[PDB]
Amino acid sequence: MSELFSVPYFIENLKQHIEMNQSEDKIHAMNSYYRSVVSTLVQDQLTKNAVVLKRIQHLDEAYNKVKRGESKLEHHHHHH
Amino acid sequence: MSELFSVPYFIENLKQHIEMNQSEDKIHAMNSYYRSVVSTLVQDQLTKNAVVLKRIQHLDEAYNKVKRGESKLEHHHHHH
Structure with missing residues (x-):
């Protein structure tokens, strides 16, 4: 019932921001969320520039x- | 040799973004110029995660x- 640890979990949270609109925005969703995690x-404990940097580089x-999904150009099949 | 050594120089560039329009924006000026520098x-050189970390923290x-130069300019939601 925890569902975490997995990197895809962090992104899956962004999908809801762009997909829905509980309390955020479209592309400007990552900037907010991204900054939220960075903080x-x-x-955390800045125990090691690497520990924090590693998460940043990966994040x-x-x-x-x-962005790659919110880019101007898109291709799929839409839905309706 | 002696040039761009002063950190305030980086900020002076931002003032132009908000003041003028060198192909940027207002507050979002820092974000664009921010992600650009840290990037x-x-x-530039990964001599040490810290060497870059300290520089980033300073930025x-x-x-x-x-922002501090602004005044919550973003549609005040009427809140203390």
């Missing part, structure tokens, strides 16, 4: 996923 | 300076 990582994968 | 500080002073 936690830095606030970039999420930010890119949103 | 370079990480690509925070710049971004904060831009």
